[model samples]
Target: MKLTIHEIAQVVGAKNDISIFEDTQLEKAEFDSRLIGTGDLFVPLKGARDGHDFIETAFENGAAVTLSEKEVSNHPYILVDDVLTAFQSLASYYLEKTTVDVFAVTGSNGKTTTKDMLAHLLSTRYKTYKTQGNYNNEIGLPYTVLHMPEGTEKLVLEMGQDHLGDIHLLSELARPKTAIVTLVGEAHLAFFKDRSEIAKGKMQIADGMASGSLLLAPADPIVEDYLPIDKKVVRFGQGAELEITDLVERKDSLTFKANFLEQALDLPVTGKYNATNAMIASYVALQEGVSEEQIRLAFQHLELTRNRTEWKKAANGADILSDVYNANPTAMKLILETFSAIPANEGGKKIAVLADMKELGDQSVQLHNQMILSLSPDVLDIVIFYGEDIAQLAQLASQMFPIGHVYYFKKTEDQDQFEDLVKQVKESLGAHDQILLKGSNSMNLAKLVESLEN
Candidate 1:
């Protein structure tokens, strides 16, 4: 953050004069008191606990100034109507002041992965920064923008949406030079009527983009309806303007060709979905004048966000494919199919531990039940279902697989039941067996993966 106290006060419309130390520069901004550093501006957000309670803690950590809704003495503070809003306003002002070219990404899935991919590719030629962790929400986006390095030439931001106008607010705030929508899926269906409605909400990323700015989106019919007519749209996928001509999915990487490229592209990540992400990212890099050689080098050493679709090893010597992040019906089915297709280790078996795909509204039960279509007794040696909603799917699997091969924990929070399931999983594993852990972040199945890891 390059803003001083007086500059921030003017931007956020602070009622009181903050010009006493007008030249005091804020080096960065943070909402967490623990992360406050010297010359940092602390923002106290109201949540389950009032952040104002941590004002003294922030100042103790070398904070130069703090944004507060209430008045404070003996400390430099900027008072505003709302701390969150004021922080957002300051971020917007800082973004406009910088000459960085912002590239924003949003979708029902793959936003973070794509953001990381794009940032990595652009870093070949520019000083780039991206949204860290799951900081893709309204607050997180602004925080990411304000914290960008001083000489950053490219900003790759990930945008997330739970309701209709969430993307719109973020788009208008960042006003990205280029926007990419990965793909629309059944994510957040509890708040939306269906996939089309989710697409409509995702399309709001173009709301703040200037006319003629590029919008890269999936070729899906659902996305076509909601795209802005004035913007230059570039579609990717089957039958799209930018299509993957050839593809091969290996155990740990992908080899593919896009219509725009002469040579085959190699991505160090697995899954055809990742290939799609790489292609979109490559296109963006190309638009920014990055050469094909630079893109090829970037993909050779791509850095992705953790827990998307990582291959790990268990302490007991079992190979684990962990994707215990957010899940929806479409993402779950795609991963199940991909993981199940890999040949099991010699004399080993394929195993899956699945939990509930949340936020499906009244259709949550049905969506859980529908996962049975992806399961196969022939391929899967054991199937473990966790969470209350998954019990229905467990019963269905039990009838299909042998009685003891199927296990379900009705209550994920019950320590005894969870421990029993863990023991059962431990006993059933072999050195060559491959296990998959897939579910929503709330299910806590990642803990089981950690327990099995060294």
Candidate 2:
């Protein structure tokens, strides 16, 4: 962001006439013109509509310089063949020159939470930056790298992929000194036949690590062989180098302990799955030379990422875990199993609210119906389905369970009916029912959560 016109042009493989304008220091780079602030450099990218249409808007909003594929009048511009490629090249160059220790993380699940935990732990000693929100794709990744402040000691980037070679491209761009994988499951399984292909795609994150750098992962036993030979790969899980030994679930949150660095420490979040994630973050922090006390303090006061295995009280008095962030058959089954295994409250009912999962291609119905394997007559009390594809699952659940307990709401007109469904759920509340809501974000179940808070 501190680049001069000449420097930026050189990095972007563009030509700009620097003699006509004074050297300006850019504060940051922005792709969205609406977000442009003073001293920002705008990089216009082409999507469905041309980003060049917004060049003047960026200038009006406070962009001092812009990267363009065509010439513009009376403004500082870097002319390049493709603005997106140029932006990526410049960001990759800047990162290489900055000499920061970058740790790139990618997996089907828990990537964002682990990145947050790592950044919080590392921030105690090093000036750390991480992938913000869900900015883990190609465009967002480059933007994150280009916007990092000077003198940062560590960077934690969340890398995601759906198609072939996406992770490889990101890893090559990041050239991370350390790489971590949280869990490789059926996140994009619609594109592949099975989990092995998913593991292969996840391995590309470590494939781009610097020679002899460290790689951290779970002992999934599936991805063990995918570890790079040139790197020092460490595993953490149930019986790995670092593991969660005990868990105590309270009414709202759960307290768990881990054997990190041979010391037992309590974690604030529920679910042994998250404890595994914290164990990796702690180990990485110690590997990076952070003090044990600093690590403990970071865990104690860490910023908890939103909506991962959280326990909340429903109006019916049942404790609920809201795992509605993004759901697939694998994740749903894992969560259902976890919920069933937990010791039940005093006479509490267990329930699940599910919606459609998109982009499963042709086998969507079969995938939806597969949820029956995770349900049992003894554990699951009520099951609700709210999507066109989930009717098959509902029909199966209804035949397996009593007729009233299995409900399907696939005929709603729009999201408003989704809200009404929440009201109906509220009406059914007893004083002590345990509910699990697992669905896509498009269903707007967060609205249900908000209503419950009131």
Candidate 3:
């Protein structure tokens, strides 16, 4: 937001002549009228409700200039053919104006954690900013760019996708100096059809980067087909250019050694996948002139965006491992492995409450059933399955596990047993029990976690 109103108008090709607004240098850009303030440029985007309706409100809230699709009787306005396109165009121009080096991050699972880690590592040596919250889409990407503070040396952007070419557009918009694709997992299988298509979308992170620019991606074979030949590719995982030498996962912390790090690093978080994320961040940090000691120090103080996979406590003192942010087959399997590997609390029994993985398309049932491979009766004493597609696995578990050890709740077009499921979970959980709750955010599993916590 270092540009004047006239400069932004020219960049966005505004239809109005705003010569009078030339004196105003903008402070911030906002789409939501409630967030508008003095010298803020209000960008009214077309959504479920027309943003034009809020233009007057934005002005009332102290907006200096506004982007509109039609003429306004009063107030300085930049009339444009499309508000969103112009906003993106303005962001593209402003990025070059600020000259901040960009680090683009995208993946099926660990993109946000990776972006946060990379930003923290770079912050040790430079002024850095990262995408705030879930703003990793087309609009959010540019918002991240325009909101970056003046004199920022590095910007870490997390790219999210639900369809093909989503990351491609973001990549072209930001034109990152370096990029990382964490891993290809079944995130949006409904739209992409398969993980390979997801890989293609994830690989689009390099679409804007010039040839020979560095790209760090997973060593998984699924990503091999989508690898960019012109760009430098460094893969991470087992037997790759960079790999984890040793990993120890505690109940609430992680200690690991990566091939790139000079010494063992510790994180106050769990999950092996997180280790990969930190290592990817560490790898890029090393290349960016941050020393191994600095990277280690950064990880020690690493702060991640909230609710990725957190450990909470129930009212009865039961340990609640809530991974309710979102879910897919790969994420479910990983967490199940982590949860199962952890020893039960004293003599406490382990329980897993799993719900449906949303948007798996025609393969939903099979995909849900595939989770059976990860659910071991020996590790978990009680298993509860909710939602429609997982019924098959619940039935299979019922046959495999001891009598009354398995439970199933239906959630389809006509039936929702969420209350009963919650009640049953409440009754079954003991003071010494360790229960895990994971499902797509749509299922409101996070709500259940809250109920358990309070």
Candidate 4:
């Protein structure tokens, strides 16, 4: 955010005269007044309340300038028709001014992990920056571009979308030099008609990329409808140009080989999904002049933005596999398959506590019951189902397995049996039993994991 107030006003076409205030280079840009500091720009956006109500408070916090939709009294202001639009304009202009090469990533899952991996690999030989936290949406993407450190050689931006044209908006703004679509799956299914529509949304990552730029995509056939003919497309998966030749998953780590790599790669994480992510980063890093040796070394110490799906110990010494952050059907099915395939702990029962997955359009019940095929009674001794839609699945499980093998807890307008769910799950655990908790983040399974850890 090295732009001055005058330059920002010029970039966003401010409607008011700001010659009354000193021309100072801003240090950071923020929408919340609490985060504002000296020489920082404040952008008031409309949420539950209008951000205009916080303008005086922003100035109180040492804001150098504020983008206002209305005329202000005595403070330095950049008046415009809209604050968000102006802020985006400033972000776009700053990226153009900096001339940093952009590497964009988006998909149903593993986008964040891939972005982190790519940044880690590129930082080995270049000044690299990446999207911090969950700022992959429109607002967060611009913030990432603006907050990049000086002399950054590569900017790895993660683009996320819930509806059509969302990724297009971000892609058109960043105009990445290289882009990767990790996979097309059922993330925001409620907002889409089918998986193809979701694939269309993911393919929007290449919307703003120049012709002949490299686009790495999955070998899944769903995305074929939206592939851009002008771009260089490289597919990865079984029988694709780049394939995982071998994969061996340990309790807490994994080692795998790719078709194009000279050596096998070891990762501290265990999901097979992560192998695809690592391979994408490795391929991109190679194109960016990072040697394969550097990629192999970087994979050894891969730093994920969020470590959601890892094993933790229960208070009673039981093992807990916590993947409670996201619960889309594709992610849910993958983790269930992964957990079931692992050898059970010695003298321990394998218990799985599965909650509801929200936002599946009208097919929520169908999707929830579909997970039944992923769970095996021979491997999992006890299965606990939580929330509303999953109750149907629990009933089906009750019929498949013997009596008392399945359990269900209520989550509805009448009652939320979260505490009971926690108590029953805790009581059923043995000293050596291993448990898995999977659900949408809103289900508060996170707190249950916390209680178990307590």
How do the predictions measure up, each by TM-score? 0.71, 0.68, 0.70, 0.71
lDDT for each residue of candidate 1 in 238-326, tens digit (9 for 90 to 100): 98899889999887778999999988998767777788888998998999999999888778876655654446688877788887543
Candidate 1 clashes between residue pairs 3 or more apart in a chain or in different chains: none
Q: How close to the true structure is residue 176 of candidate 2, measured as C-alpha lDDT?
A: 92
Would you list the clashing residue pairs of candidate 3?
none
Q: What is candidate 4's TM-score against the reference?
A: 0.71
Error of 3 at 336 (Å): 28
Rank order by lDDT, top first? 4, 3, 1, 2
Give me the candidate number with maximum lDDT: 4
1-454 in candidate 2: lDDT tens per residue?
5577668877887765655666688888987665799888898875323578779888988988889888799998888888989988988998988878889987524423888888988999999998876678788799889878877889999898756668999899989989888774332133455677667778889766767788887688878777788888888777887677876765535566677655555556666566667778778889999988888767776566554344766544457677754344555666767677655567667777887776656657877887788888688777778778888888999999976987777544653356557766776556677777777766377777767656
Alpha-carbon runs more than 4 Å astray in model 4:
108-112, 184-188, 307-446, 449-454
Question: What are the per-residue Cα lDDT tens digits for candidate 3 across 95-159?
Answer: 88888999998753542388788888999999999888667887788899999988899999999
Residue-pair clashes per candidate: 0, 4, 0, 0
Each prediction's whole-model lDDT (CA) = 0.81, 0.75, 0.83, 0.84
TM-score of candidate 1 on Cα atoms, chains taken together:
0.71
Runs with alpha carbons beyond 4 Å of true place in candidate 2: 15-20, 108-112, 184-190, 252-257, 308-454
Task: Quote the positional error of residue 244 for candidate 2 in Å.
Answer: 2.7
Off by over 4 Å in 3: 20-22, 108-112, 308-454
